[PDB]
Design a binder for this molecule. Structure first.
Ligand code: A1CL9
Length: 166
């Protein structure tokens, strides 16, 4: 949890323009959040990047979790190993609004972060799930009460977020 170069937006939300994979390898936080789908198939986006950085160990472990427990619900989560990235990986499913899933479930997705005092995380439902990333940051700020360090890869998006929030 030795985070560096973050900008404090609220009492508990910090943001950096950084690749979440590089942040996790540098900091080795207690918890790294994955933006997952209900079957934990880490095919692209943040999920594909985190799985690739574990050389598919996250995917093998995720397939075993699904075989024994069944899929997650949208808005739900599970805690699995963080492998070489963190002590734990909190896989969280935000709604895929491009497929009609309710945007109200973005609040339930971010409520899962409150179970952990400190987390390294990406924005949920941004990217291929189609939610507006500034709206996703607003829900994070209104919902998360524990300390969250958000890593945002895209510099153009990072600048837009910092201007809208402060
Ligand atoms: O922070 C971003 O720019 C977006 C917003 C939500 C998903 C983030 C993202 C997407 C792909 C990625 N691919 C490799 C590493 C990190 C990655 C992060």
């Amino acid at each position: 949890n030795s985070f560096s170069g973050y900008l404090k937006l609220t009492d508990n939300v910090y943001i950096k323009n950084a690749d979440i994979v590089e942040e996790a390898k540098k900091v080795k936080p207690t918890v790294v959040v994955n933006a997952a789908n209900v079957y934990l198939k880490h095919g692209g986006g943040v999920a594909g990047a985190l799985n690739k950085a574990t050389n598919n160990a996250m995917q093998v472990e995720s397939d075993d979790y699904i075989a024994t427990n069944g899929p997650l619900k949208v808005g739900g989560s599970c805690v699995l190993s963080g492998h070489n990235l963190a002590k734990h990986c909190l896989h969280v499913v935000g709604p895929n609004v491009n497929k009609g899933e309710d945007i109200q479930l973005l609040k339930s997705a971010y409520e899962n972060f409150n179970q952990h005092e400190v987390l390294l995380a990406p924005l949920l439902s941004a990217g291929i799930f189609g939610a507006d990333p500034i709206h996703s940051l607003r829900v994070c700020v209104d919902t998360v009460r524990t300390n969250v360090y958000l890593a945002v890869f895209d510099k153009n998006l990072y600048d837009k977020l910092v201007s809208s929030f402060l």
